[PDB]
Amino acid sequence: SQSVLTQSASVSGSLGQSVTISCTGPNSVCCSHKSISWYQWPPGRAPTLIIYEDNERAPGISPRFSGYKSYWSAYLTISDLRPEDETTYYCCSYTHNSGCVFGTGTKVSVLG
């Protein structure tokens, strides 16, 4: 592991509650001069784009998901935790003509 973009390690929640996962790196990958994409990614399988351009969701994404980007970090909140939210989440910094600088993952547990 060598990702320059750190997340909130791991975090947990309970049914009906809301979570939040950080995402921040140095001045070279975050944030006021870079977009941020949030990916739901089960272990070694088919991922899913959740949020691009800091606060825009992908098609069909449930309104529970939300984003926010300050000048030094971006956050992914998961309103109304449902049982199908046990997985790991990664972020990514990018512009129009660059690549996805991924994050260090944040496994989320909904045990309740």
Partner: protein
Amino acid sequence: QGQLVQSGATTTKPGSSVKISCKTSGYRFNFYHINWIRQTAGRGPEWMGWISPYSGDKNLAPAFQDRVNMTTDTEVPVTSFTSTGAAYMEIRNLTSDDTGTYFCAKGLLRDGSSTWLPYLWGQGTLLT
């Protein structure tokens, strides 16, 4: 809104080179870039690069430049808004550090600031 089926699970040994396929269907293959990502047992996810089925353009991360052979076919139109194409992924100096799951990812949009963002993923292929 279409499928991106890839090859099987072909495992070779260091120094060699492996070809990974990525056949499209159900969406205009020329309208969206094709990205290549992987998750190796040793790091997390790593972005490798994308290619344009229309512009023929290539942009990869400097970490995978002098190792990746990335190409595409030319879509076979099914309808006015459908097509079927295929992207190809090869690597040069192969090792056991590169062992992991690989997929292709169709771009998000056709314009704006999030055009190439890997939206639609394939199925995954296990390397060496």
